[model samples]
Target chain A: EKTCDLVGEKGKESEKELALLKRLTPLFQKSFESTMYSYVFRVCREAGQHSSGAGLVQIQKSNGKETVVGRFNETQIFQGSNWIMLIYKGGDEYDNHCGREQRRAVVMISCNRHTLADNFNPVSEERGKVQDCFYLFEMDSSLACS
Target chain B: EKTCDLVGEKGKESEKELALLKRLTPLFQKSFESTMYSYVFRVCREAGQHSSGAGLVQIQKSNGKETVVGRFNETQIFQGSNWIMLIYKGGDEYDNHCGREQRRAVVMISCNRHTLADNFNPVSEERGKVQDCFYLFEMDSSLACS
Candidate 1:
């Protein structure tokens, strides 16, 4: 989607973000798979006013190209303990068992205020911030599924 | 489709391993936009072989039912690096980018021979029996085409 652009101001901004993400990718991947990672930007709302919520995005790569595997929109807080888990499989589309369906992994990105600022790493070191994304991997025998 | 019977016993798999994946919907959705995490598994490959490789599965709750969003296979290996990156975006069919081509954050799963046996949880002091699975996590703001 976002090509390797190099405009004056936008280029500088994109370059900075790219560099930041590149740096963060390895450190974050050190925590899991290199294919998936998430950052949260929370937005807190006031009483009587509905929350505009946050967005959760996931990235997956194959055949030298990338794809957005998951994107869920909501207007509430994302819970880490009960909110994240695996769901769904496949039918008969592409690769019956493996490629038929995409197993879902929810990682929620959270915030307290709707209007947030852009920091180097907007995600807070909190369970709530992790609500935007979750992970799905190969089953290690039937025991690992549940 | 693999019925319960096909999921069969361990060691002897029918490719269509499990009967079905669970459904959790957006219950896992975080309030933020980009967050990522991963799980790992070290398989006992056929002698002189590695795993079929690695991949990611995604599930979503929709209309009271679970929907399979996407599944990805690792076209490459996670070598010379500590983690393996998986893609879920930029696919022709999963073009969720504003409903056109959506991009998801790639996930990373980390592991070793021994911890690989433990499935990515290399926290324990125990060694040996390296046949296991592992898990890892990453963060991001990007897109891909796979």
Candidate 2:
């Protein structure tokens, strides 16, 4: 019958979704600090144990070298849901979990948007100014939003 | 005295969130009336029509032969978002999009999960059956309970 045709309906099929990951240049400033800083606000990826824990990673220039300006904690490692939105501040220098002195970091997380640029499109168009990372993300079954 | 060779202090970085994704698979499900139903979701690589449009592609098996179930709608192109997700249920017998009969069917989408009867463990384990069928899904973005 007509239902048996696989290639018969080729023209009926259409496009679905698109996504990508990108890398960017470092941002630098003298008075720039995580407590009061400018975030690329880019989409993130969680690379598992291969990378740092759940958090937002801010890249900035310091001492004429490219380095990690901050890592903002987002979700709990084995106990949280999908990569939901989060806010991070840097004013707490004495806070042990997030202080003013960590460097050379990679932040892995997922974003609803396609890439970092789309997530932060209100600012700049230089795709190289931000980085988009990705990882295999799984949600908690008990918290089924569907 | 060196912290690594002399003091004998060694630290390793770990990304527990990514590891969780590597280990967790959340199952979701949805129901549809065998007639005319359509759902929408998303994926993204760009912000405008420059990005590919979104549609549906049904995976079906009939008479032991693989086939695509029905026809698709508009390309549904938009800007400010790079990706989109879509789900639709309908039969030509009910709507004008295509022509067919009315029959109940189950559809499922699975991503980032371990398969049943894995050889990683030398022991034969009855892990349980995984049902990968659904008609709709909704996710929360407000950092709901995990």
Candidate 3:
């Protein structure tokens, strides 16, 4: 199966997005875990083939319930002064959470002088209303500087 | 002044450590903040000069007191299964904490599939006993992987 591609022809057409995609290529097919929140995720790829989620996942450790936090099928990428924001949308509905809205995830990638990229963490999870529900995450990488 | 050098002739002689140093060169001159514990840090370099410590720093926000978590003078690096452990010791003594023993810091670096290096966080702080005083940190970076 082909891995997910957040930047396709669209990024190729926009030059900057294409370059950002190239800079982030090394993290294309790997998996990450945030033990603090019991979350598992992947960038530019599905976390797994299971029905719970596609790109990012959150777990309910009590019952081992998996919630789809975001998907890779529909994505957006933005480059800021010293950061890159990758957003994923169109995920499965949340189970008894977020007003049962479709899942979403926004990852903030910042510049780091210590390593190429690292510090995958959940910054906050917006809930309450359907329109306000989204997952926020922050990461660091020197590659995001330029 | 020159930035601190963690891998000098020693890592050069060790070869593997030197390679790991090269892989982690990007993180040498930066600062990281761990808001969870009110900590600030730098790799292979002192966090700041006007502090009570260097390398890894912990701030007591209540009174604006700074604690040195670790120093850059003496350091050690180890390569594990898809991980790297960087340790810094010989910091100033704590303020009525950690049995008033000299401070120390141990950073655990792991692999990430999302970026080059990111997700720097504090793991735990060992205290109470002079011999057991050390700050533990965890970070993710594909550069740590073999």
Best by lDDT: 3
Error of 2 at A57 (Å): 10
Put down candidate 2 lDDT per residue, A1-146, tens digits, no spaces.
11111112333321110011111111111111132223333223321222543133333334332222223332111111222212222211222332222222222223333332222212111111111112111111211211
lDDT by residue for model 3 over A1-146, one digit each (tens)?
A: 44444433433333444466677778885677774347777876767547543788887778776767888776666554456667788767867765677888878777787877777878666553324357777777787786
CAPRI quality level assigned to candidate 1 from its DockQ score: incorrect
Top TM-score: which candidate number? 3
lDDT of 2 at A124: 15
Q: What is the Cα root-mean-square deviation between model 2 and the actual structure?
A: 21.4
What are the runs in model 1 whose C-alpha is more than 4 Å off? A1-146, B1-55, B61-70, B88-99, B102-105, B112-114, B117-146
Q: Write one digit per residue (lDDT tens) for candidate 1, span B1-146.
A: 21112112353332212211111112112111111222222111111112212122222223322122222221111111223333332212232222233222233333243332112221211111111111223322111111
Model 3's chain B TM-score?
A: 0.80
For residues A1-146, could you state the per-residue lDDT of candidate 1 as single tens digits?
A: 32222222443333332442332232221122222344222111111112312122222223332222322221111112111112111111223333244322232222223222112121111111111122332211111111
Q: Write the per-residue lDDT of candidate 2 for residues B31-119, one digit (tens) a residue.
A: 12111222222211111121222222222223222222222221111111211122222212223222333211212222223332111
Q: For every candidate structure, what is the RMSD over all alpha carbons to the true structure, in angstroms?
A: 20.8, 21.4, 17.7
The runs of at least 3 residues in candidate 3 whose Cα sits more than 4 Å from the true structure, single-residue gaps closed, are A1-14, A49-53, A95-99, B1-146
State which candidate, 1 or 3, has the greater TM-score.
Answer: 3
Error of 2 at B97 (Å): 21
> How do the candidates rank by TM-score, highest first?
3, 1, 2
**How would you encode candidate 3's per-residue C-alpha lDDT over B80-139 as one tens digit per residue?**
445666777877777796557788887867667676777788866655332445677878
For candidate 3 chain B, the 10 contiguous residues with the lowest summed lDDT are B4-13
Ranking by lDDT: 3, 1, 2
